[PDB]
Amino acid sequence: MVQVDGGRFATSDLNDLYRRLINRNNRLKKLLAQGAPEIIIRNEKRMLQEAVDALLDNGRRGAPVTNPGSDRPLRSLTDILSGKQGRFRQNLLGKRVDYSGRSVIVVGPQLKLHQCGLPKRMALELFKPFLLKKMEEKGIAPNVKAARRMLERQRDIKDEVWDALEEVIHGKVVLLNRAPTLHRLGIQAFQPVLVEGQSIQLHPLVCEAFNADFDGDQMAVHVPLSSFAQAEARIQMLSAHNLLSPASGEPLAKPSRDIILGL
Amino acid sequence: TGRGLSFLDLIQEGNQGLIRAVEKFEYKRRFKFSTYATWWIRQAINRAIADQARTIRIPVHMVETINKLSRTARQLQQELGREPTYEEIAEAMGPGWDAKRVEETLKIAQEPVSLETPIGDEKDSFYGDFIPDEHLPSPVDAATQSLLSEELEKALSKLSEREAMVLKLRKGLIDGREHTLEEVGAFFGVTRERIRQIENKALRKLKYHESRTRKLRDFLD
């Protein structure tokens, strides 16, 4: 039961179901205590059963319990566990992650097979803690907090922080991912190259593997944090390290479109 | 029906009323039982609705007040050909009612909304998914407080152990609570004046060290 922005209250359906259960239970105890006839007690017990049922699995037997002035079934425990929206699939086998971003992909040819264009601002927010530590190591900020406050406003940013950010990401890689991810090449590792502008630059040869084109596709970026994660991404997941399809065995990264045309 | 309670619930509460009636009935008055029973049934049902309808429980008298406010505002909207203001409802409610009171009464009658109310027309999204958690400390907050304790210890190490311990006991960094001058004085075996003077010189040396190094400024927000 939480007070939201405007000062109003928002609550789960489980509270309503539990309320129903508690009410019918208490009324049953009082009915018994006053020695009500059998029909009344039987009815009360039946209602108690249906209450427990609605609490555990709603809609399983009979009409699904709803809120007043709503046709929307209350969300029970069973509904919380199972389903595509269920606990397992929604919050367990997949999760939303920190140190991630997304933007519009745009081609560039200049990139080496192992590289990708990464917008400066995106890089700043993604690598932000490393940028703080590096800004502290250098003379740009007295400490961490001062650095963070310095990054808070856009007009408080100077060029030293950008060069420092270059020193941060050196040798490091990021993961690029395009949905839907149909196979393990839907996620690939690249060394970022910081670029002005808001678009992520993608290498032409990996387009086929990602099934990505330039009609307005968007990609997501992730930053492996630990030295272990980085080792994994650089050895195993690096774009230039997977040249062949794990499925057929034929080269996945190969000339296409304009390249084939010219040759 | 439709008052916030299920049909069967109303039936059971009405049954409780019926039982009260059976116990309180007097056949000597020659009345039919239905007449006397109806009163206790209505009473039981209304008590039930007033009690159990709202997720956040409102005392029966306050409920009655809120309802009177409803019927009042509805009468006013039916006569004026538009929704009334707070001031008009305040007028129509008689003496002792102002705009502020009506506003607060409406504020206190607000029912909560479901976290599961779907947003977007689809099976995809829930309202509760868009509501941040203001309770648990963000990683930035944890980092900030940690760096704060570490920096305060770095600053307290530049003192002697006695005066630093005096400051830690007086601000409660040790056991979690702030000791009085007499307790710290009795712990170090000195007069309260003495321990207060030690606290003062410690605070002074800290203020000097702070003016010099400018280290603890950023944490002051």
Partner: peptide, 14 residues
């Protein structure tokens, strides 16, 4: 199946 109906019927027996 429908609790209301069942209870109305139980009531009707008296």
């Amino acid at each position: 199946s429908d609790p209301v109906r069942q209870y109305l019927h139980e009531i009707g027996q008296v």
